[PDB]
């Protein structure tokens, strides 16, 4: 068997900064959100690609 | 609710449970006066009662029990209190009575 | 009702304003259906064959 | 040959008021007239309290 | 509301038709404008600041342009109609306590694991009837889901009668059995609820449910007292709030993201719509290629949301207005 | 409301061939055409079976 | 109380006496004279003459 | 199934176990969820009911169990789960329950 994946992206989100005015959060494997510090959104894509 | 039962708590509790409890944090001690504990035993008791597999036995559960008296030599003592129930799959069900309701 | 409220902590503020918490959630979803089509785009209706 | 029912649902066939019979227990009706004679064996189903035994006719 | 796109959407509001780029004297007012060869299109919407002009649509490079109607976006609210079972009894038993369980999914958190449950209970007596069973429910599920101490309004129970199975009435924590005079009634509807909606902070969301009945002993075995059927949906949820939702992210594209951060050092967006309103709505999508290398594809699409006076006129001509502009055949609502 | 019987006396209360029940037993006979009913209650008086419950007249 | 079961074991309705008229002779005779309700409540018994 | 049956499941894995497996070797553990045990429990029960020839007495099993309170001297607790079978000849079904079903 055989699968694939992608995700397309613009390209300012190369350092994007975010301003943490709610919190950003991340999914995880379980099926709870948790709350992260990182500011930076690239950090919250590759998580979720994996 | 307008009438109380214990097939109405440990449905609530145990769905509840399912949900949002770990099979091993499922004891639920309930807050209550002694007008509710008292209807907890009688719903109890009535499950119970239809447990017609099983025969309840007074040495095992000492419901009627023996007590030193004068007007007789076996002179006996009844009665008994459910004050907690079991249900399957972790659930326990205590009672911590309050003064305050 | 004291010792009821003697139940409970006490948290020290240093206000009388209103203060406000952030909450985390959950995220495994199901997406509803909303409804189905032929291949002609008629609607699926429930008494309809395959 | 076997016995009919576990003895926890035979040690509630009572012998009481048709009023106070609720399920979970079976009803007896002794005869007066006659000594050793039964009247009805009786069950409630809905409420009502109503007889196990089917009515006989000649 | 954050939404998915194909790397852009916009959207315009034709609160009036006008014929010329000198009639956008209004706010909303809108005109679409194509060459007589027909090569480009695109529309000049009156801003509140001024006048405005939609990119161009190149009318050989159009995906799908397709007209959507309110009906289609009125979410259908989700009854389930309940009953006694003829086969334990069609009749409630006299001594058994009849709960019912409706349990809630996707209640406050996002997910399914985000479970909630709500009761209904009522021992029955011996010269109890349907009519009255079902009564009682109702009132018990309404003590229980139509209070006024729950902060969501999970379902709205109704009741039918017989003599009109048309007519629905409603119970609420307040409605006492004495409101309930008829002595024919044959099952309990139960709606879903439009949820709180806030612009840009709430989406319109639901909480859908199952009603799972609980056993009764009847002739000394467990069995259901009732059954759940879904039947065809009466009340629906306008769209008014999803479109202002859309224009509240689309007017963050061709306008400020930062629509409250840091607030006295804002721009305020004026956005257009009422989301009181019932909109029906047109999605072009097209793409831009490029010359000899850049022959990928910049997909686009951009909305129009007009508004609806049953009958889907404002948009057939809005329709009728792009169609012998653009020569494009659209079909009409 | 106490029991009809004692239990060393119900627990003989038994179900199957009506030629092998003793004189310290009670017969019971569910009733075939109906689920859940009774047909007759017997016990052996003088090596016959003979209906506990009396019989019914018009 | 017919959810229960009162067992001669527990209770000693029929106690065992020794005799001369057997070697399994039996005593039998039993009185309630004390109430266990719920919630503390306990109702015991002082005979008094004088009633 | 429709209706799950401990009598066709003893029936199933009894003739299996005979003819692929040593009376040593005939222990069968179930995966399945916290509803299906309830499913087991209800069903060994209903079987043991059957079991007329026999007598569950409360002082072997403890279905009602004796706990201290404050309320009442003779204070009791009430409840039980079967999660075991046991057919002839080996077979001894035991039961695994997973939060993944």
């Known amino acids: 068997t055989t699968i694939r994946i992608q995700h397309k992206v613009a390209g300012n989100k190369l350092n994007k900064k975010l301003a943490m005015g709610i919190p950003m959060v991340r999914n995880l494997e379980s099926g709870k959100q948790v709350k992260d510090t990182a500011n930076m959104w690239m950090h919250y894509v590759d998580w979720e690609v994996e | 609710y307008n009438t109380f039962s214990l097939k109405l708590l440990e449905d609530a509790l145990y769905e509840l449970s399912a949900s949002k409890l770990a099979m091993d944090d499922r004891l639920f001690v309930i807050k209550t006066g002694e007008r509710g504990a008292i209807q907890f035993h009688k719903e109890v008791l009535k499950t119970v009662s239809g447990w017609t597999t099983f025969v309840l036995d007074n040495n095992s559960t000492r419901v009627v029990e023996k007590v030193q008296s004068r007007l007789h030599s076996n002179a006996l003592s009844a009665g008994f209190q459910f004050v907690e129930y079991k249900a399957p799959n972790g659930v326990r069900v205590r009672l911590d009575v309050d003064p305050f309701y | 009702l004291d010792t009821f409220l003697n139940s409970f902590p006490t948290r020290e503020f240093e206000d009388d304003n209103e203060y406000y918490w952030d909450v985390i959630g959950s995220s495994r979803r199901n997406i509803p259906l909303v409804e189905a089509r032929d291949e002609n785009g008629v609607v699926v209706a429930a008494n309809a064959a395959n | 040959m076997k016995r009919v029912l576990n003895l926890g649902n035979l040690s509630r066939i009572v012998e009481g008021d048709p009023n106070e019979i609720t399920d979970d227990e079976i009803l007896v009706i002794k005869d007066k007239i006659i000594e050793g004679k039964i009247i009805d064996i009786q069950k409630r189903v809905d409420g009502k309290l109503v007889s196990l035994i089917t009515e006989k006719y000649t | ?333």
């Open chain 5, 1 to 333: 509301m954050v939404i998915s796109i194909n790397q852009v959407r916009q959207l315009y509001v034709a609160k009036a038709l006008k014929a010329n780029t000198a009639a956008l004297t209004t706010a909303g007012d809108i005109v679409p404008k194509a060459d007589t060869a027909k090569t480009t299109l695109y529309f000049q919407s009156m801003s509140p600041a001024g006048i405005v002009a939609s990119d161009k649509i190149n009318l050989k490079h159009v995906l799908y342009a397709k007209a959507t109607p309110s009906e289609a976006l009125a979410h259908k609210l989700v009854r389930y109609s309940v009953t006694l079972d003829a086969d334990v009894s069609a009749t409630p038993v006299a001594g058994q306590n009849y709960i019912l369980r409706l349990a809630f999914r996707q209640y406050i958190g996002l997910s399914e694991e985000d479970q909630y449950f709500k009761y209904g209970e009522v021992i029955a007596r011996s010269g109890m009837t349907a009519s009255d069973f079902y009564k009682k429910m109702a009132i018990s599920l309404a003590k229980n889901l139509e209070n006024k101490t729950e902060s969501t309004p999970l379902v709205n129970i109704y009741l039918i009668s017989a003599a009109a199975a048309s007519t629905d009435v409603p119970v609420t924590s307040a409605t006492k059995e004495s409101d309930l005079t008829a002595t024919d009634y044959n099952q309990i509807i139960i709606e879903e609820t439009e949820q709180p909606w806030v612009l840009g902070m709430m989406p319109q969301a639901f909480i859908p449910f199952t009603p799972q009945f609980l056993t009764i002993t009847v002739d000394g075995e467990d069995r259901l007292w009732g059954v759940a059927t879904v039947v065809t949906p009466t009340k629906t949820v306008p769209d008014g709030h999803l479109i202002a939702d859309l224009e509240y992210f689309c007017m963050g594209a061709r306008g400020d993201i930062y629509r409250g951060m840091g607030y006295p050092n804002i721009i305020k967006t004026t956005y257009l719509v009422d989301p009181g309103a019932v909109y029906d709505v047109l999605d072009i999508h097209y793409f831009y290629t490029g010359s000899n290398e850049s022959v990928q594809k910049s997909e686009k699409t951009i909305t129009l949301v007009a508004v609806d006076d049953g009958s889907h006129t404002a948009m057939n001509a809005l329709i009728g207005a792009i169609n012998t502009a653009s020569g494009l055949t659209i079909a009409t609502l």
